[PDB]
Design a binder for this molecule. Structure first.
Ligand code: AEF
Ligand code: AEF
Lengths: 131, 131
């Protein structure tokens, strides 16, 4: 009855939006094991953009999140069908993944806007009137 | 065999230092229930200092932390012996609490410096040379 779920990401400056996404993946089925993949520093900076925390730091933080059962750190930057077979993964949860949908292994999850870490720094700054 | 542990705090902009502290409280004994108290907005600002996230936001974030079994939100600003009796609390874990030590109900925990949220914003800013 136990369904292996895989989610990946940078998880830089972990905030409530990441946590809500992890929870939703974990609760896709009644009985799950959620594996979370954490992207490497060199590959993230080359392909996506700047990251402030190292792989070690980003991974140590995810360890404290209730919904996380396993962590692959670093994870591969591209999910392959060999990867799914090797870790006996039943679904990938993300927010091209055409082949994942074709195989029935795709489960969508939602981003929550406005809860980010950068948003909080903006809130602190609003305390200082421009004039 | 199950030991009720109580920890309280502001938990504004939750970071790895808070998480490590919660873990340490949770692992004080083999078999624990960790209750976490979250201080109110009005009382924190009057007595400690400024807080950026509301009570609701600070509490919703703690809900995702693996070590947290129960949350009292808002918690009282001062722990009283009536409070310990009402929630059948065996130890309070903090980092005056003289009466707690006299009763054998005090367990110390450690702050981890340098992992804070404000520290990360400083790191982002170091990317911009003064000149
Ligand atoms: N969430 C950031 C985008 C991304 C996700 C997963 C991955 O393997 C590579 C990039
Ligand atoms: N960690 C901030 C200091 C504080 C802790 C607990 C409490 O009930 C009131 C203030």
């Amino acid at each position: 009855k136990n369904v292996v779920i895989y989610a990946d990401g940078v998880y830089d400056m972990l905030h409530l939006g990441h946590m809500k996404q992890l929870e939703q993946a974990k609760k896709l089925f009644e009985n799950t094991t959620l594996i979370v993949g954490v992207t490497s520093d060199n590959e993230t900076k080359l392909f996506k953009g700047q990251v402030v925390q190292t792989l070690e730091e980003r991974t140590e933080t995810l360890k404290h999140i209730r919904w996380v059962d396993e962590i692959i750190s670093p994870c591969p930057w591209v999910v392959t069908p060999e990867f799914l077979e090797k870790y006996k993964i039943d679904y990938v949860a993300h927010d091209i993944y055409a082949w994942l949908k074709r195989a029935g292994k795709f489960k969508a999850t939602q981003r929550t806007e406005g809860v980010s870490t950068t948003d909080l720094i903006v809130r602190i700054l609003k305390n200082y009137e421009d004039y």
